[PDB]
Short mmCIF file of all heavy atoms in Angstrom, two decimals:
data_model
loop_
_atom_site.label_atom_id
_atom_site.label_comp_id
_atom_site.label_asym_id
_atom_site.label_seq_id
_atom_site.Cartn_x
_atom_site.Cartn_y
_atom_site.Cartn_z
N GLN A 1 -68.11 -253.50 -14.40
CA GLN A 1 -67.61 -254.59 -15.24
C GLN A 1 -68.29 -254.60 -16.60
O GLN A 1 -67.63 -254.77 -17.64
CB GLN A 1 -67.80 -255.93 -14.55
CG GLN A 1 -66.77 -256.26 -13.54
CD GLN A 1 -67.06 -257.57 -12.88
OE1 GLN A 1 -67.95 -258.30 -13.29
NE2 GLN A 1 -66.31 -257.88 -11.85
N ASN A 2 -69.60 -254.41 -16.62
CA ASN A 2 -70.33 -254.36 -17.88
C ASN A 2 -69.96 -253.14 -18.69
O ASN A 2 -70.11 -253.14 -19.92
CB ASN A 2 -71.83 -254.36 -17.61
CG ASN A 2 -72.36 -255.72 -17.33
OD1 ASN A 2 -71.78 -256.72 -17.76
ND2 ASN A 2 -73.47 -255.79 -16.62
N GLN A 3 -69.50 -252.07 -18.04
CA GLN A 3 -69.01 -250.92 -18.78
C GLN A 3 -67.65 -251.19 -19.39
O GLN A 3 -67.36 -250.75 -20.51
CB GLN A 3 -68.94 -249.69 -17.87
CG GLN A 3 -70.19 -248.84 -17.87
CD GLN A 3 -69.95 -247.47 -17.31
OE1 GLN A 3 -68.81 -247.09 -17.04
NE2 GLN A 3 -71.01 -246.71 -17.13
N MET A 4 -66.79 -251.91 -18.67
CA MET A 4 -65.48 -252.20 -19.22
C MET A 4 -65.56 -253.19 -20.36
O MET A 4 -64.74 -253.13 -21.28
CB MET A 4 -64.54 -252.71 -18.14
CG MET A 4 -63.14 -252.81 -18.65
SD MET A 4 -61.89 -253.13 -17.43
CE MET A 4 -60.44 -253.33 -18.46
N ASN A 5 -66.55 -254.08 -20.36
CA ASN A 5 -66.72 -254.96 -21.52
C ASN A 5 -66.95 -254.18 -22.81
O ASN A 5 -66.65 -254.67 -23.89
CB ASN A 5 -67.86 -255.94 -21.32
CG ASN A 5 -68.01 -256.88 -22.48
OD1 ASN A 5 -67.03 -257.30 -23.06
ND2 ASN A 5 -69.24 -257.20 -22.83
N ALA A 6 -67.49 -252.97 -22.71
CA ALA A 6 -67.70 -252.14 -23.89
C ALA A 6 -66.54 -251.19 -24.15
O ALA A 6 -66.20 -250.94 -25.31
CB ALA A 6 -68.99 -251.34 -23.76
N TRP A 7 -65.94 -250.65 -23.09
CA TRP A 7 -64.81 -249.76 -23.27
C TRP A 7 -63.62 -250.50 -23.86
O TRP A 7 -62.87 -249.94 -24.67
CB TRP A 7 -64.44 -249.14 -21.93
CG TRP A 7 -63.30 -248.22 -21.93
CD1 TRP A 7 -63.33 -246.89 -22.15
CD2 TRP A 7 -61.95 -248.54 -21.62
NE1 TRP A 7 -62.08 -246.36 -22.03
CE2 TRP A 7 -61.21 -247.36 -21.71
CE3 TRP A 7 -61.29 -249.72 -21.31
CZ2 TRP A 7 -59.85 -247.32 -21.48
CZ3 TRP A 7 -59.94 -249.68 -21.08
CH2 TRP A 7 -59.23 -248.49 -21.17
N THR A 8 -63.44 -251.77 -23.49
CA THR A 8 -62.36 -252.54 -24.09
C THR A 8 -62.65 -252.87 -25.55
O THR A 8 -61.74 -252.89 -26.38
CB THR A 8 -62.13 -253.81 -23.29
OG1 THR A 8 -61.55 -253.46 -22.03
CG2 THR A 8 -61.17 -254.70 -24.00
N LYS A 9 -63.92 -253.10 -25.89
CA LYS A 9 -64.27 -253.27 -27.29
C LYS A 9 -64.00 -252.01 -28.09
O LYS A 9 -63.59 -252.09 -29.25
CB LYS A 9 -65.73 -253.68 -27.44
CG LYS A 9 -66.14 -253.95 -28.87
CD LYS A 9 -67.32 -254.90 -28.96
CE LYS A 9 -67.09 -255.95 -30.03
NZ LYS A 9 -68.21 -256.91 -30.14
N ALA A 10 -64.23 -250.84 -27.50
CA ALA A 10 -63.95 -249.60 -28.19
C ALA A 10 -62.47 -249.24 -28.19
O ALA A 10 -62.06 -248.37 -28.96
CB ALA A 10 -64.74 -248.45 -27.57
N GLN A 11 -61.66 -249.88 -27.35
CA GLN A 11 -60.21 -249.70 -27.48
C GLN A 11 -59.59 -250.69 -28.45
O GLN A 11 -58.55 -250.39 -29.04
CB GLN A 11 -59.53 -249.84 -26.12
CG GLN A 11 -59.86 -248.74 -25.15
CD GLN A 11 -59.16 -247.45 -25.49
OE1 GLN A 11 -57.94 -247.39 -25.58
NE2 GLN A 11 -59.94 -246.39 -25.68
N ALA A 12 -60.20 -251.86 -28.63
CA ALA A 12 -59.68 -252.81 -29.61
C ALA A 12 -60.05 -252.40 -31.03
O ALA A 12 -59.34 -252.76 -31.97
CB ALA A 12 -60.20 -254.21 -29.32
N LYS A 13 -61.14 -251.67 -31.19
CA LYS A 13 -61.49 -251.10 -32.48
C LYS A 13 -60.68 -249.85 -32.77
O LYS A 13 -60.74 -249.33 -33.88
CB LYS A 13 -62.99 -250.79 -32.50
CG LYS A 13 -63.55 -250.35 -33.82
CD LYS A 13 -65.02 -250.03 -33.67
CE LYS A 13 -65.54 -249.29 -34.89
NZ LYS A 13 -64.78 -248.03 -35.11
N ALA A 14 -59.93 -249.35 -31.79
CA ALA A 14 -59.04 -248.23 -32.02
C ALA A 14 -57.60 -248.66 -32.23
O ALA A 14 -56.79 -247.88 -32.74
CB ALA A 14 -59.10 -247.23 -30.87
N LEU A 15 -57.24 -249.87 -31.80
CA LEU A 15 -55.99 -250.48 -32.19
C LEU A 15 -56.13 -251.39 -33.40
O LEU A 15 -55.18 -252.08 -33.76
CB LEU A 15 -55.40 -251.28 -31.03
CG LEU A 15 -54.67 -250.48 -29.97
CD1 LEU A 15 -53.91 -251.41 -29.05
CD2 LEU A 15 -53.74 -249.49 -30.62
N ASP A 16 -57.31 -251.42 -34.02
CA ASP A 16 -57.50 -252.07 -35.30
C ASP A 16 -57.32 -251.12 -36.46
O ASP A 16 -56.91 -251.55 -37.54
CB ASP A 16 -58.90 -252.67 -35.38
CG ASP A 16 -58.93 -254.13 -35.02
OD1 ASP A 16 -57.86 -254.69 -34.71
OD2 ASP A 16 -60.03 -254.71 -35.02
N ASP A 17 -57.63 -249.85 -36.27
CA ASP A 17 -57.49 -248.85 -37.31
C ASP A 17 -56.17 -248.11 -37.23
O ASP A 17 -55.92 -247.23 -38.06
CB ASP A 17 -58.65 -247.85 -37.23
CG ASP A 17 -59.98 -248.52 -37.46
OD1 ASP A 17 -60.05 -249.75 -37.31
OD2 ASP A 17 -60.95 -247.81 -37.80
N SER A 18 -55.33 -248.43 -36.26
CA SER A 18 -53.99 -247.91 -36.21
C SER A 18 -52.94 -248.99 -36.37
O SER A 18 -51.75 -248.66 -36.44
CB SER A 18 -53.75 -247.15 -34.91
OG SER A 18 -54.66 -246.07 -34.81
N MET A 19 -53.33 -250.25 -36.39
CA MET A 19 -52.45 -251.31 -36.85
C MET A 19 -52.64 -251.58 -38.33
O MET A 19 -51.71 -252.05 -38.99
CB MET A 19 -52.68 -252.58 -36.05
CG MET A 19 -51.53 -253.54 -36.09
SD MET A 19 -51.56 -254.66 -34.69
CE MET A 19 -50.60 -256.01 -35.33
N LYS A 20 -53.81 -251.27 -38.88
CA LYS A 20 -53.97 -251.23 -40.33
C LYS A 20 -53.05 -250.18 -40.94
O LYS A 20 -52.35 -250.44 -41.92
CB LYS A 20 -55.41 -250.92 -40.69
CG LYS A 20 -56.36 -252.07 -40.65
CD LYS A 20 -57.76 -251.54 -40.85
CE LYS A 20 -58.73 -252.64 -41.20
NZ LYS A 20 -58.75 -253.70 -40.16
N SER A 21 -53.07 -248.97 -40.38
CA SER A 21 -52.28 -247.90 -40.94
C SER A 21 -50.80 -248.06 -40.67
O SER A 21 -50.02 -247.19 -41.07
CB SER A 21 -52.73 -246.56 -40.39
OG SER A 21 -51.69 -245.61 -40.51
N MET A 22 -50.39 -249.11 -39.98
CA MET A 22 -48.99 -249.48 -39.92
C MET A 22 -48.68 -250.68 -40.80
O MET A 22 -47.58 -250.76 -41.37
CB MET A 22 -48.56 -249.80 -38.49
CG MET A 22 -47.08 -249.84 -38.31
SD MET A 22 -46.32 -248.36 -38.97
CE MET A 22 -44.59 -248.77 -38.81
N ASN A 23 -49.63 -251.60 -40.94
CA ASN A 23 -49.49 -252.67 -41.91
C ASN A 23 -49.29 -252.10 -43.31
O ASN A 23 -48.52 -252.64 -44.10
CB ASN A 23 -50.71 -253.57 -41.89
CG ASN A 23 -50.60 -254.66 -40.89
OD1 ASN A 23 -49.50 -255.04 -40.50
ND2 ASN A 23 -51.73 -255.17 -40.45
N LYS A 24 -50.01 -251.03 -43.63
CA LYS A 24 -49.92 -250.51 -44.98
C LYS A 24 -48.55 -249.91 -45.25
O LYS A 24 -48.00 -250.08 -46.34
CB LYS A 24 -51.02 -249.49 -45.23
CG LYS A 24 -52.38 -250.10 -45.41
CD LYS A 24 -53.43 -249.15 -44.91
CE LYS A 24 -54.59 -249.03 -45.85
NZ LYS A 24 -55.68 -248.26 -45.24
N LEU A 25 -47.98 -249.21 -44.27
CA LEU A 25 -46.63 -248.68 -44.47
C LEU A 25 -45.60 -249.80 -44.52
O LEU A 25 -44.63 -249.72 -45.27
CB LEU A 25 -46.28 -247.67 -43.40
CG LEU A 25 -47.25 -246.51 -43.29
CD1 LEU A 25 -46.73 -245.53 -42.30
CD2 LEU A 25 -47.44 -245.86 -44.62
N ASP A 26 -45.81 -250.87 -43.76
CA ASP A 26 -44.87 -251.98 -43.84
C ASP A 26 -44.93 -252.66 -45.20
O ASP A 26 -43.89 -253.01 -45.77
CB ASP A 26 -45.13 -252.99 -42.73
CG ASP A 26 -44.40 -252.64 -41.46
OD1 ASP A 26 -43.75 -251.58 -41.43
OD2 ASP A 26 -44.47 -253.42 -40.50
N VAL A 27 -46.13 -252.83 -45.76
CA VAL A 27 -46.20 -253.49 -47.05
C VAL A 27 -45.71 -252.58 -48.16
O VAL A 27 -45.10 -253.04 -49.13
CB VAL A 27 -47.61 -254.01 -47.34
CG1 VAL A 27 -48.55 -252.88 -47.50
CG2 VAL A 27 -47.61 -254.82 -48.60
N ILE A 28 -45.92 -251.27 -48.03
CA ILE A 28 -45.38 -250.36 -49.03
C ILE A 28 -43.86 -250.34 -48.98
O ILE A 28 -43.20 -250.30 -50.03
CB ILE A 28 -45.97 -248.96 -48.84
CG1 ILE A 28 -47.41 -248.95 -49.30
CG2 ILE A 28 -45.25 -247.97 -49.67
CD1 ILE A 28 -48.05 -247.66 -49.08
N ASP A 29 -43.28 -250.40 -47.78
CA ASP A 29 -41.83 -250.50 -47.70
C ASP A 29 -41.33 -251.79 -48.32
O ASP A 29 -40.31 -251.80 -49.02
CB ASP A 29 -41.35 -250.41 -46.27
CG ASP A 29 -39.98 -250.99 -46.09
OD1 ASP A 29 -39.01 -250.32 -46.49
OD2 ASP A 29 -39.85 -252.12 -45.58
N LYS A 30 -42.02 -252.90 -48.07
CA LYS A 30 -41.60 -254.16 -48.66
C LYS A 30 -41.69 -254.12 -50.17
O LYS A 30 -40.85 -254.70 -50.87
CB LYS A 30 -42.43 -255.30 -48.10
CG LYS A 30 -42.02 -256.65 -48.60
CD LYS A 30 -43.09 -257.67 -48.31
CE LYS A 30 -44.39 -257.30 -49.00
NZ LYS A 30 -45.44 -258.33 -48.76
N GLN A 31 -42.68 -253.42 -50.71
CA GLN A 31 -42.77 -253.28 -52.16
C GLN A 31 -41.62 -252.45 -52.71
O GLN A 31 -40.99 -252.82 -53.71
CB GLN A 31 -44.10 -252.65 -52.55
CG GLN A 31 -45.21 -253.64 -52.62
CD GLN A 31 -45.08 -254.56 -53.78
OE1 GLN A 31 -44.84 -255.75 -53.62
NE2 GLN A 31 -45.23 -254.02 -54.97
N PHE A 32 -41.34 -251.31 -52.09
CA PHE A 32 -40.20 -250.52 -52.54
C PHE A 32 -38.92 -251.32 -52.47
O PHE A 32 -38.04 -251.18 -53.33
CB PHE A 32 -40.07 -249.24 -51.72
CG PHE A 32 -40.81 -248.07 -52.30
CD1 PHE A 32 -41.88 -248.25 -53.13
CD2 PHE A 32 -40.43 -246.78 -52.01
CE1 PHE A 32 -42.56 -247.17 -53.64
CE2 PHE A 32 -41.11 -245.71 -52.53
CZ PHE A 32 -42.17 -245.91 -53.34
N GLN A 33 -38.78 -252.19 -51.47
CA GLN A 33 -37.53 -252.92 -51.31
C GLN A 33 -37.42 -254.08 -52.28
O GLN A 33 -36.32 -254.44 -52.69
CB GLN A 33 -37.38 -253.44 -49.88
CG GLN A 33 -36.82 -252.43 -48.92
CD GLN A 33 -35.41 -252.03 -49.26
OE1 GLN A 33 -34.62 -252.86 -49.70
NE2 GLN A 33 -35.08 -250.77 -49.05
N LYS A 34 -38.54 -254.68 -52.65
CA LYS A 34 -38.48 -255.67 -53.71
C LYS A 34 -38.24 -255.03 -55.06
O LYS A 34 -37.71 -255.67 -55.97
CB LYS A 34 -39.75 -256.50 -53.73
CG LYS A 34 -39.73 -257.64 -52.77
CD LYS A 34 -41.12 -258.06 -52.43
CE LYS A 34 -41.87 -258.42 -53.67
NZ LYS A 34 -41.27 -259.60 -54.33
N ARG A 35 -38.65 -253.77 -55.23
CA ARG A 35 -38.39 -253.09 -56.49
C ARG A 35 -36.96 -252.58 -56.58
O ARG A 35 -36.38 -252.55 -57.67
CB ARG A 35 -39.37 -251.93 -56.67
CG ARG A 35 -39.09 -251.02 -57.82
CD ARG A 35 -39.50 -251.63 -59.12
NE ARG A 35 -39.11 -250.79 -60.24
CZ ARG A 35 -39.94 -249.99 -60.89
NH1 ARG A 35 -41.22 -249.95 -60.54
NH2 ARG A 35 -39.52 -249.26 -61.91
N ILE A 36 -36.36 -252.20 -55.45
CA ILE A 36 -35.00 -251.68 -55.47
C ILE A 36 -34.00 -252.81 -55.66
O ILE A 36 -33.10 -252.73 -56.50
CB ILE A 36 -34.72 -250.91 -54.17
CG1 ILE A 36 -35.35 -249.53 -54.23
CG2 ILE A 36 -33.25 -250.78 -53.94
CD1 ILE A 36 -34.95 -248.69 -53.09
N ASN A 37 -34.15 -253.88 -54.89
CA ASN A 37 -33.20 -254.98 -54.97
C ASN A 37 -33.28 -255.75 -56.28
O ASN A 37 -32.65 -256.80 -56.40
CB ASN A 37 -33.42 -255.95 -53.81
CG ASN A 37 -32.98 -255.37 -52.50
OD1 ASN A 37 -32.28 -254.37 -52.46
ND2 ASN A 37 -33.39 -256.00 -51.41
N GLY A 38 -34.06 -255.27 -57.25
CA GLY A 38 -34.02 -255.83 -58.59
C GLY A 38 -35.12 -256.81 -58.92
O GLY A 38 -34.85 -257.86 -59.52
N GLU A 39 -36.35 -256.50 -58.56
CA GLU A 39 -37.48 -257.37 -58.86
C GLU A 39 -38.63 -256.54 -59.40
O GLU A 39 -38.80 -255.38 -59.04
CB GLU A 39 -37.91 -258.17 -57.64
CG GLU A 39 -36.82 -259.10 -57.10
CD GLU A 39 -36.72 -259.09 -55.59
OE1 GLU A 39 -37.61 -258.52 -54.94
OE2 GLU A 39 -35.75 -259.66 -55.04
N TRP A 40 -39.41 -257.15 -60.29
CA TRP A 40 -40.36 -256.41 -61.13
C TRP A 40 -41.77 -256.52 -60.56
O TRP A 40 -42.61 -257.29 -61.02
CB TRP A 40 -40.29 -256.92 -62.56
CG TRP A 40 -38.90 -257.01 -63.04
CD1 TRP A 40 -38.19 -258.14 -63.28
CD2 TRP A 40 -38.01 -255.92 -63.30
NE1 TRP A 40 -36.92 -257.83 -63.69
CE2 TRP A 40 -36.79 -256.47 -63.71
CE3 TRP A 40 -38.14 -254.53 -63.23
CZ2 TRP A 40 -35.71 -255.68 -64.04
CZ3 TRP A 40 -37.06 -253.76 -63.57
CH2 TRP A 40 -35.87 -254.33 -63.96
N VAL A 41 -42.03 -255.71 -59.54
CA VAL A 41 -43.34 -255.59 -58.94
C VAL A 41 -43.67 -254.12 -58.80
O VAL A 41 -42.82 -253.31 -58.42
CB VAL A 41 -43.41 -256.32 -57.58
CG1 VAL A 41 -42.61 -255.58 -56.53
CG2 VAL A 41 -44.84 -256.47 -57.14
N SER A 42 -44.90 -253.76 -59.14
CA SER A 42 -45.28 -252.36 -59.18
C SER A 42 -45.22 -251.75 -57.79
O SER A 42 -45.26 -252.45 -56.78
CB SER A 42 -46.68 -252.21 -59.74
OG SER A 42 -47.50 -253.24 -59.24
N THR A 43 -45.11 -250.43 -57.74
CA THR A 43 -45.09 -249.71 -56.48
C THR A 43 -46.16 -248.64 -56.40
O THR A 43 -46.12 -247.81 -55.49
CB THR A 43 -43.74 -249.08 -56.22
OG1 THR A 43 -43.64 -247.87 -56.96
CG2 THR A 43 -42.63 -250.00 -56.65
N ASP A 44 -47.11 -248.62 -57.33
CA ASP A 44 -48.25 -247.73 -57.18
C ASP A 44 -49.11 -248.19 -56.02
O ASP A 44 -49.20 -249.38 -55.72
CB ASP A 44 -49.06 -247.72 -58.47
CG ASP A 44 -49.95 -246.52 -58.57
OD1 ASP A 44 -49.82 -245.61 -57.73
OD2 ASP A 44 -50.79 -246.49 -59.50
#
């Protein structure tokens, strides 16, 4: 049980760095879509 308390912490820190890398693609898509539909926000 004490081992799983740490293994689960190391799995939640691995779904934190792969939900970041999906948040970033979602926000980049939202930026491209606000720029395409006719709004003036940068996409760099």
Side-chain angles (χ1 to χ4, degrees):
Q1 279 178 8
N2 280 335
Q3 268 197 7
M4 189 170 175
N5 182 37
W7 179 89
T8 290
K9 183 155 225 179
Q11 293 285 303
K13 187 182 167 302
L15 280 192
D16 264 359
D17 298 19
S18 300
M19 201 158 157
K20 279 172 165 57
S21 158
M22 195 51 187
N23 272 337
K24 285 149 135 171
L25 303 185
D26 273 4
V27 66
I28 287 177
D29 160 75
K30 183 195 61 178
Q31 277 290 112
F32 269 25
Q33 276 296 323
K34 275 157 57 65
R35 171 77 185 258
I36 282 188
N37 289 345
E39 298 138 10
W40 312 109
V41 71
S42 40
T43 80
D44 200 9

